[PDB]
mmCIF file of C-alpha atoms in Angstrom:
data_model
loop_
_atom_site.group_PDB
_atom_site.id
_atom_site.type_symbol
_atom_site.label_atom_id
_atom_site.label_comp_id
_atom_site.label_asym_id
_atom_site.label_seq_id
_atom_site.Cartn_x
_atom_site.Cartn_y
_atom_site.Cartn_z
ATOM 1 C CA UNK D 73 70.979 94.343 83.671
ATOM 2 C CA UNK D 74 74.400 96.919 83.206
ATOM 3 C CA UNK D 75 77.509 95.344 83.070
ATOM 4 C CA UNK D 76 80.580 96.860 81.897
ATOM 5 C CA UNK D 77 82.462 96.399 78.920
ATOM 6 C CA UNK D 78 86.618 95.487 79.628
ATOM 7 C CA UNK D 79 88.279 99.073 80.308
ATOM 8 C CA UNK D 80 90.981 96.789 82.099
ATOM 9 C CA UNK D 81 93.255 95.422 79.233
ATOM 10 C CA UNK D 82 96.825 95.424 80.872
ATOM 11 C CA UNK D 83 98.150 98.262 82.729
ATOM 12 C CA UNK D 84 94.466 98.561 83.839
ATOM 13 C CA UNK D 85 93.256 96.873 86.663
ATOM 14 C CA UNK D 86 89.297 96.590 88.067
ATOM 15 C CA UNK D 87 88.200 95.215 91.028
ATOM 16 C CA UNK D 88 84.943 95.128 92.967
ATOM 17 C CA UNK D 89 83.512 97.571 90.514
ATOM 18 C CA UNK D 90 86.574 99.819 90.195
ATOM 19 C CA UNK D 91 89.628 100.470 87.831
ATOM 20 C CA UNK D 92 93.190 101.716 88.080
ATOM 21 C CA UNK D 93 94.533 103.644 85.039
ATOM 22 C CA UNK D 94 98.067 102.867 85.078
ATOM 23 C CA UNK D 95 100.615 104.956 83.123
ATOM 24 C CA UNK D 96 104.158 106.752 82.814
ATOM 25 C CA UNK D 97 105.353 110.101 83.521
ATOM 26 C CA UNK D 98 107.867 112.303 85.000
ATOM 27 C CA UNK D 99 106.187 115.159 87.531
ATOM 28 C CA UNK D 100 105.088 115.617 90.756
ATOM 29 C CA UNK D 101 102.129 114.663 92.819
ATOM 30 C CA UNK D 102 100.001 117.736 91.704
ATOM 31 C CA UNK D 103 100.645 116.945 88.731
ATOM 32 C CA UNK D 104 99.355 112.900 88.817
ATOM 33 C CA UNK D 105 95.777 114.422 90.720
ATOM 34 C CA UNK D 106 95.706 116.626 87.675
ATOM 35 C CA UNK D 107 96.214 114.451 85.077
ATOM 36 C CA UNK D 108 93.652 112.340 86.448
ATOM 37 C CA UNK D 109 91.528 114.891 86.850
ATOM 38 C CA UNK D 110 91.333 115.838 83.264
ATOM 39 C CA UNK D 111 89.287 113.250 82.626
ATOM 40 C CA UNK D 112 91.162 109.994 83.263
ATOM 41 C CA UNK D 113 89.479 109.292 86.718
ATOM 42 C CA UNK D 114 90.957 109.989 90.171
ATOM 43 C CA UNK D 115 93.657 109.952 92.212
ATOM 44 C CA UNK D 116 93.896 105.858 92.932
ATOM 45 C CA UNK D 117 94.642 106.732 96.803
ATOM 46 C CA UNK D 118 94.922 103.364 97.157
ATOM 47 C CA UNK D 119 93.663 101.245 100.230
ATOM 48 C CA UNK D 120 94.307 97.903 99.579
ATOM 49 C CA UNK D 121 97.625 95.987 100.010
ATOM 50 C CA UNK D 122 96.452 94.132 97.114
ATOM 51 C CA UNK D 123 96.007 97.452 95.197
ATOM 52 C CA UNK D 124 99.361 98.847 96.116
ATOM 53 C CA UNK D 125 101.133 96.025 95.739
ATOM 54 C CA UNK D 126 99.641 95.492 92.079
ATOM 55 C CA UNK D 127 100.589 99.116 91.211
ATOM 56 C CA UNK D 128 103.655 98.541 93.021
ATOM 57 C CA UNK D 129 104.871 95.829 91.443
ATOM 58 C CA UNK D 130 103.547 97.310 88.170
ATOM 59 C CA UNK D 131 106.045 100.189 89.195
ATOM 60 C CA UNK D 132 109.277 98.908 87.417
ATOM 61 C CA UNK D 133 111.807 101.215 87.804
ATOM 62 C CA UNK D 134 109.391 104.499 88.658
ATOM 63 C CA UNK D 135 106.947 104.553 91.362
ATOM 64 C CA UNK D 136 103.548 105.579 91.203
ATOM 65 C CA UNK D 137 101.214 108.404 92.560
ATOM 66 C CA UNK D 138 98.463 107.859 94.876
ATOM 67 C CA UNK D 139 95.258 110.294 95.994
ATOM 68 C CA UNK D 140 97.198 111.288 99.503
ATOM 69 C CA UNK D 141 97.601 114.295 100.332
ATOM 70 C CA UNK D 142 98.855 115.360 104.150
ATOM 71 C CA UNK D 143 96.798 118.690 105.283
ATOM 72 C CA UNK D 144 100.680 120.341 106.358
ATOM 73 C CA UNK D 145 103.428 118.305 107.409
ATOM 74 C CA UNK D 146 102.772 116.503 110.847
ATOM 75 C CA UNK D 147 98.966 116.486 110.631
ATOM 76 C CA UNK D 148 96.854 113.901 109.091
ATOM 77 C CA UNK D 149 97.096 112.521 105.623
ATOM 78 C CA UNK D 150 93.867 113.159 103.951
ATOM 79 C CA UNK D 151 92.856 111.350 100.420
ATOM 80 C CA UNK D 152 92.455 113.737 97.325
ATOM 81 C CA UNK D 153 88.834 112.519 97.299
ATOM 82 C CA UNK D 154 88.709 114.279 100.603
ATOM 83 C CA UNK D 155 88.642 111.121 102.707
ATOM 84 C CA UNK D 156 91.097 110.683 106.025
ATOM 85 C CA UNK D 157 93.598 107.298 105.463
ATOM 86 C CA UNK D 158 92.252 104.180 106.780
ATOM 87 C CA UNK D 159 94.912 101.817 106.201
ATOM 88 C CA UNK D 160 98.121 103.630 104.883
ATOM 89 C CA UNK D 161 101.746 102.355 103.927
ATOM 90 C CA UNK D 162 104.355 104.790 104.336
ATOM 91 C CA UNK D 163 107.192 102.860 105.637
ATOM 92 C CA UNK D 164 107.207 102.370 109.318
ATOM 93 C CA UNK D 165 110.710 102.542 110.080
ATOM 94 C CA UNK D 166 112.396 104.568 107.686
ATOM 95 C CA UNK D 167 115.771 106.210 109.324
ATOM 96 C CA UNK D 168 116.913 109.257 107.476
ATOM 97 C CA UNK D 169 113.532 109.257 105.188
ATOM 98 C CA UNK D 170 110.761 110.979 107.862
ATOM 99 C CA UNK D 171 112.347 114.447 108.589
ATOM 100 C CA UNK D 172 112.483 116.332 105.541
ATOM 101 C CA UNK D 173 108.319 117.177 105.153
ATOM 102 C CA UNK D 174 105.205 115.653 104.317
ATOM 103 C CA UNK D 175 102.381 116.693 101.935
ATOM 104 C CA UNK D 176 102.015 113.883 99.393
ATOM 105 C CA UNK D 177 102.592 110.188 99.455
ATOM 106 C CA UNK D 178 104.672 108.002 96.900
ATOM 107 C CA UNK D 179 105.083 104.600 96.343
ATOM 108 C CA UNK D 180 108.645 102.520 95.676
ATOM 109 C CA UNK D 181 111.840 101.412 97.740
ATOM 110 C CA UNK D 182 109.906 98.206 99.911
ATOM 111 C CA UNK D 183 107.362 98.188 97.013
ATOM 112 C CA UNK D 184 104.924 100.109 99.328
ATOM 113 C CA UNK D 185 104.693 103.794 100.424
ATOM 114 C CA UNK D 186 106.978 106.352 101.531
ATOM 115 C CA UNK D 187 104.942 109.958 102.618
ATOM 116 C CA UNK D 188 107.371 112.723 102.302
ATOM 117 C CA UNK D 189 106.843 116.455 101.164
ATOM 118 C CA UNK D 190 106.617 116.216 97.530
ATOM 119 C CA UNK D 191 110.430 116.330 96.407
ATOM 120 C CA UNK D 192 110.044 112.271 95.516
ATOM 121 C CA UNK D 193 110.326 112.090 91.771
ATOM 122 C CA UNK D 194 108.419 109.118 90.604
ATOM 123 C CA UNK D 195 108.049 108.041 87.187
ATOM 124 C CA UNK D 196 104.248 106.784 86.787
ATOM 125 C CA UNK D 197 100.824 108.057 86.199
ATOM 126 C CA UNK D 198 98.194 105.770 88.549
ATOM 127 C CA UNK D 199 94.659 106.461 88.888
ATOM 128 C CA UNK D 200 91.330 105.158 89.564
ATOM 129 C CA UNK D 201 87.923 105.573 87.379
ATOM 130 C CA UNK D 202 84.972 102.913 87.243
ATOM 131 C CA UNK D 203 85.091 100.099 85.061
ATOM 132 C CA UNK D 204 84.057 101.610 81.440
ATOM 133 C CA UNK D 205 83.944 100.766 77.564
ATOM 134 C CA UNK D 206 86.308 101.871 74.571
ATOM 135 C CA UNK D 207 84.861 103.355 71.682
ATOM 136 C CA UNK D 208 86.035 102.847 68.274
ATOM 137 C CA UNK D 209 86.601 106.750 68.578
ATOM 138 C CA UNK D 210 88.340 107.150 71.634
ATOM 139 C CA UNK D 211 91.903 106.139 72.339
ATOM 140 C CA UNK D 212 92.152 102.234 72.468
ATOM 141 C CA UNK D 213 94.279 100.055 70.261
ATOM 142 C CA UNK D 214 94.438 100.287 66.521
ATOM 143 C CA UNK D 215 96.928 97.416 66.083
#
């Protein structure tokens, strides 16, 4: 046996066996990937309409950052984990929102994704990590 504990109280969300660390912030995409890479988990890189909707709904007035990074521009979108997209969500018909650049994908607007260079000013740090426990020494509740 080897069941996890409960690292997903509220903001955090667990699925098949992984969880998502949902938080707030104010920077760029590169800052999100680096923030989760520090120790958190990984850049989410949502691939399930439910997971994307989950954080999308979780995002009150500030979108979230996903594990999506495009090669150059009109090329192909690759996940920070080193895996090409499979479903993608970047708003299909988004007039005056596709001709400017592409490199990082953000989430907002129609509760979905938006593909753009990296000028999108979001405000939520979303990361993914395998469900773990919560020691009394590390950050927990203390309330």
